[PDB]
Amino acid sequence: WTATSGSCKGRCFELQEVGPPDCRCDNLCKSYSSCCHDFDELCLKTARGWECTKDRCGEVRNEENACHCSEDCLSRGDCCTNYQVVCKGESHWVDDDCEEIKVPECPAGFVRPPLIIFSVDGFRASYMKKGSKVMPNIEKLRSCGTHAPYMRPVYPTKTFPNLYTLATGLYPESHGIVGNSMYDPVFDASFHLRGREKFNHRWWGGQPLWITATKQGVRAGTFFWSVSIPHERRILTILQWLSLPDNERPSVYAFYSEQPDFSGHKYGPFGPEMTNPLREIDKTVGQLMDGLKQLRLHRCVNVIFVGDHGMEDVTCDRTEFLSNYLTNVDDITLVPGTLGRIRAKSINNSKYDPKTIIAALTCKKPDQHFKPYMKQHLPKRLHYANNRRIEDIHLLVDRRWHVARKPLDVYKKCFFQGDHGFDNKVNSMQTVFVGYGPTFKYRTKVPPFENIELYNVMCDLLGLKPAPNNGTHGSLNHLLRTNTFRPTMPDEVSRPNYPGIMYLQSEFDLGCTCDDKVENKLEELNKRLHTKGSTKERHLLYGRPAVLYRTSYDILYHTDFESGYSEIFLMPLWTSYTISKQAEVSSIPEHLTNCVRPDVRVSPGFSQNCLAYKNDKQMSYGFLFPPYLSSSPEAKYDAFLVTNMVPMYPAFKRVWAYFQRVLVKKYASERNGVNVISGPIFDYNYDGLRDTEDEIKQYVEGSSIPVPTHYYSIITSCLDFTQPADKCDGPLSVSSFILPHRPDNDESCNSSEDESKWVEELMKMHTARVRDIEHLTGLDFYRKTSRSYSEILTLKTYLHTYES
Ligand SMILES: *[C@@H]1O[C@H](CO)[C@@H](O[C@@H]2O[C@H](CO)[C@@H](O[C@H]3O[C@H](CO[C@H]4O[C@H](CO)[C@@H](O)[C@H](O[C@H]5O[C@H](CO)[C@@H](O)[C@H](O)[C@@H]5O[C@H]5O[C@H](CO)[C@@H](O)[C@H](O)[C@@H]5O)[C@@H]4O)[C@@H](O)[C@H](O[C@H]4O[C@H](CO)[C@@H](O)[C@H](O)[C@@H]4O[C@H]4O[C@H](CO)[C@@H](O)[C@H](O)[C@@H]4O)[C@@H]3O)[C@H](O)[C@H]2NC(C)=O)[C@H](O)[C@H]1NC(C)=O
Ligand SMILES: CS(=O)(=O)N1Cc2cnc(N[C@H]3Cc4cc(Cl)cc(C#N)c4C3)nc2C1
Ligand SMILES: [Ca+2]
Ligand SMILES: [Ca+2]
Ligand SMILES: [K+]
Ligand code: NA
Numbered sequence: 001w002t003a004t005s006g007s008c009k010g011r012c013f014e015l016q017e018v019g020p021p022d023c024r025c026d027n028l029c030k031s032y033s034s035c036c037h038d039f040d041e042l043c044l045k046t047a048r049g050w051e052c053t054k055d056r057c058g059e060v061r062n063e064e065n066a067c068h069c070s071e072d073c074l075s076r077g078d079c080c081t082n083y084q085v086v087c088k089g090e091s092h093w094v095d096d097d098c099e100e101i102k103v104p105e106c107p108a109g110f111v112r113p114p115l116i117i118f119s120v121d122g123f124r125a126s127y128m129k130k131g132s133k134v135m136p137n138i139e140k141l142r143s144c145g146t147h148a149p150y151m152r153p154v155y156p157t158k159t160f161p162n163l164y165t166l167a168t169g170l171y172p173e174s175h176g177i178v179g180n181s182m183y184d185p186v187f188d189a190s191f192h193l194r195g196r197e198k199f200n201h202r203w204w205g206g207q208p209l210w211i212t213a214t215k216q217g218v219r220a221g222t223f224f225w226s227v228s229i230p231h232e233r234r235i236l237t238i239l240q241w242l243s244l245p246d247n248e249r250p251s252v253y254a255f256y257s258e259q260p261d262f263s264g265h266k267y268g269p270f271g272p273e274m275t276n277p278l279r280e281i282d283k284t285v286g287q288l289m290d291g292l293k294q295l296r297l298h299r300c301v302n303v304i305f306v307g308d309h310g311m312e313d314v315t316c317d318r319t320e321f322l323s324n325y326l327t328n329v330d331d332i333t334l335v336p337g338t339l340g341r342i343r344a345k346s347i348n349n350s351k352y353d354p355k356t357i358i359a360a361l362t363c364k365k366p367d368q369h370f371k372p373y374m375k376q377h378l379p380k381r382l383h384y385a386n387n388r389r390i391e392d393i394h395l396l397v398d399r400r401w402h403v404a405r406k407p408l409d410v411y412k413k414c415f416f417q418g419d420h421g422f423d424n425k426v427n428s429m430q431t432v433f434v435g436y437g438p439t440f441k442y443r444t445k446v447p448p449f450e451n452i453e454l455y456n457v458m459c460d461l462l463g464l465k466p467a468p469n470n471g472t473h474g475s476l477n478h479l480l481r482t483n484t485f486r487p488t489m490p491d492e493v494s495r496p497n498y499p500g501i502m503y504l505q506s507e508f509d510l511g512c513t514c515d516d517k518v519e520n521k522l523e524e525l526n527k528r529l530h531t532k533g534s535t536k537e538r539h540l541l542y543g544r545p546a547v548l549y550r551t552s553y554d555i556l557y558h559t560d561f562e563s564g565y566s567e568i569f570l571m572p573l574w575t576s577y578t579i580s581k582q583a584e585v586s587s588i589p590e591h592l593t594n595c596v597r598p599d600v601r602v603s604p605g606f607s608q609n610c611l612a613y614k615n616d617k618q619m620s621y622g623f624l625f626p627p628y629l630s631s632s633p634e635a636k637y638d639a640f641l642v643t644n645m646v647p648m649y650p651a652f653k654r655v656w657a658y659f660q661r662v663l664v665k666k667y668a669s670e671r672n673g674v675n676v677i678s679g680p681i682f683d684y685n686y687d688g689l690r691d692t693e694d695e696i697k698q699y700v701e702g703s704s705i706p707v708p709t710h711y712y713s714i715i716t717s718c719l720d721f722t723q724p725a726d727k728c729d730g731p732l733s734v735s736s737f738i739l740p741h742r743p744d745n746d747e748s749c750n751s752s753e754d755e756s757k758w759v760e761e762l763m764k765m766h767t768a769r770v771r772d773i774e775h776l777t778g779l780d781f782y783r784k785t786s787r788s789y790s791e792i793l794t795l796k797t798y799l800h801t802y803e804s
């Protein structure tokens with residue numbers, strides 16, 4: 001209940017919201033049906049529209065008018081945004097030459113440059129080029145400020161998940177807004193775009209920027225606007241707030257536009273009806289910038305122009321129906337559209353079986369337009385699993401398609417031509433970033449980056465300490481003229497052991513065999529040098545990775561590779577090796593097919609054993625340094641050490657052997673050498689973070705050898721490919737992957753074919769950032785380079801996306 005009989009007199013767009021039953025006058029009161037009875041009359045004036053005309057110049061103030069053109073309007077802070085152009089002979093901001101903003105040029109009383117976020121819904125990255133002729137204000141921000149060719153959203157590429165990620169720096173799995181529709185089984189409560197449940201604070205985790213500001217003594221404008229408040233009124237409200245007294249005035253603001261998303265759903269991303277929404281957004285940017293110029297704030301404020309996600313062509317005919325796959329379609333609940341989420345319709349139904357649902361949805365139709373996953377098996381780059389609001393069964397829907405439960409869902413609820421929500425690496429889902437102002441760089445292009453990184457920068461722009469988040473603070477320092485964040489590398493927690501030869505062959509009872517009895521002080525000296533690390537500078541190009549947790553591990557040197565060997569997990573944490581462009585691929589010799597060799601540097605008690613693999617009928621083994629890329633027949637024996645072995649399902653060995661035998665050489669050929677760091681990952685609780693030993697759910701039968709959930713590789717070369725990877729003077733280039741260690745190839749519908757037709761497609765889907773592997777391993781890479789630490793942080797956030 002609300003006492004609407006109160007009044008908004010002197011309260012219009014008040015910044016602190018009052019508590020029920022008191023009536024409200026803030027920018028969200030309409031959304032709560034709680035505005036005072038006189039809110040429209042006092043706070044949403046429309047009379048005479050939004051623009052000064054020559055006849056209004058120097059008018060007697062009429063308080064009924066939407067905006068003013070009276071001599072007192074700049075003093076009151078309520079001029080129409082074109083007042084000085086129409087009435088005082090000024091230019092529009094967009095008609096002024098770009099002039100570098102080297103320092104903030106702020107009115108007396110401004111303690112810091114304000115930040116204004118201009119957020120646009122559904123603004124696809126390619127609109128910046130394709131719509132340039134109709135967006136002059138936006139094109140001036142873009143060309144004169146700092147811009148990226150695109151900004152990568154989070155998955156799912158829906159509105160609330162992405163806006164709340166912009167606000168928090170968190171993945172959706174961490175902030176809790178995992179879709180635009182959600183069921184929380186602990187709350188037994190449903191979140192929808194329509195209705196009141198979504199206003200309950202229990203949905204919204206993390207700490208959004210307006211809370212971070214307020215807690216640190218920086219005042220914020222409210223970021224949410226009720227839909228019926230016209231954009232012109234939103235702009236005039238921001239400009240009026242910027243005219244408040246110093247002690248009352250916010251330092252951070254947000255504008256929001258529902259366009260171009262609203263029209264893009266109706267007309268498609270490039271429908272001819274899309275030009276007018278782009279022109280209208282541009283005009284709104286112009287009102288803001290002319291308004292700031294009037295207030296002498298246009299060389300004071302930092303402006304961010306940012307979108308939440310893009311927009312794809314999607315029509316009602318491109319819908320897959322689960323009723324064409326499942327016997328049991330009435331026993332499931334589907335969250336449908338550009339992603340699927342499946343759970344039981346009733347938790348009382350004991351016949352419900354996720355395994356039979358997955359199997360019925362797997363590679364059943366030749367051009368099937370979705371792929372089912374258990375959420376832990378989703379590509380790790382999506383970071384879409386560690387939340388009870390994310391159903392165990394997920395459908396990744398192909399771009400341009402929908403999934404629905406039954407056909408009647410699509411026509412008993414069409415005409416739409418656009419949608420979004422797909423995999424956040426899809427080109428059509430990419431969105432925009434421009435930063436303009438004193439704290440941003442001038443006429444600067446930056447590479448694409450992820451929207452999780454922006455919260456830290458907005459905190460930098462406001463002098464705030466960010467709440468703990470999933471950005472990598474410093475990775476976006478190259479956007480900024482000033483207020484850079486200069487972190488120190490994390491401290492190494494565990495120092496390695498450097499074991500020498502300590503064990504005789506006969507002390508090992510591992511059940512291993514190798515045909516390696518083949519008896520020269522020239523080479524015997526060389527053998528010793530290689531075991532002491534004489535080739536380590538070729539194979540360890542960027543320093544030893546640092547271990548950022550407490551453990552026991554050994555550095556093991558070899559002719560062709562170096563490893564950090566865990567005495568706790570009985571296998572390497574990392575294996576590092578360099579493959580030149582000139583490297584030769586060889587076979588595993590016939591006599592060595594089943595060769596495994598004890599490592600006389602490592603105790604039998606801290607070694608794997610071959611008998612466990614013989615007894616475990618499901619599990620086989622592979623090697624981290626590939627025997628195919630040995631430098632010589634003699635060096636190849638090192639590759640068969642028990643300390644280089646890792647557990648691998650036979651199905652996974654098809655993937656891994658193709659990577660090692662074909663793809664590493666291909667990348668060395670293409671990139672002018674590569675350095676490879678490979679290793680295991682254990683994430684049985686799918687939280688994106690290194691498991692401790694007591695979290696491991698599977699061992700090699702009858703042993704303490706833990707089974708990885710994933711295998712990674714980090715593949716580094718010189719960005720200037722005219723220099724070989726091992727003699728690179730400048731910036732680096734990286735690609736990485738986190739491959740799921742699965743006992744079948746059910747994810748790859750063409751896996752019956754030769755690996756040349758499916759394995760690289762699998763690896764592209766599971767592309768990763770170095771930072772993703774850092775979280776999953778507790779390792780810190782690139783500790784010893786010639787490069788600035790912020791440049792290395794940017795490299796660690798890079799994702800190789802494999803889009804055209
Ligand atoms: C992205 O960046 C984020 C932010 O840095 C980071 O997430 C942080 O990860 C930490 C490890 O998973 C975790 O640390 C402690 O969490 C709780 C305290 O949690 C509450 O308080 C904080 C601080 O204000 C809140 O932010 C937090 O919000 C979460 O829960 C809300 C209510 O559910 C929810 O609204 C909100 O969205 C958020 O949920 C998310 O995180 C939770 C986990 O907290 C997930 O479950 C959700 O699915 C969702 O993902 C809370 O209100 C501490 O209690 C923990 O300590 C445990 O566990 C330790 C084990 O290592 C142990 O040593 C401790 O003794 C203690 O154990 C006890 O409890 C166990 C579990 O119940 C029990 O089994 C055991 O026997 C014993 O009794 C953690 O130290 C942070 O909460 C988390 N923050 C946020 C914001 O998510 C992400 O990891 C990265 N991502 C990547 C990939 O890098
Ligand atoms: C889903 S929707 O259509 O129902 N909807 C209505 C509505 C109203 N105002 C806004 N304002 C945005 C402006 C902004 C900027 C940044 Cl950086 C982070 C966040 C967050 N968080 C927001 C909220 N957004 C929406 C999204
Ligand atoms: Ca949106
Ligand atoms: Ca984990
Ligand atoms: K076996
Ligand atoms: Na298959």
Ligand SMILES: [Zn+2]
Nearest residue numbers: 122261265420
């Ligand atoms: Zn939309």
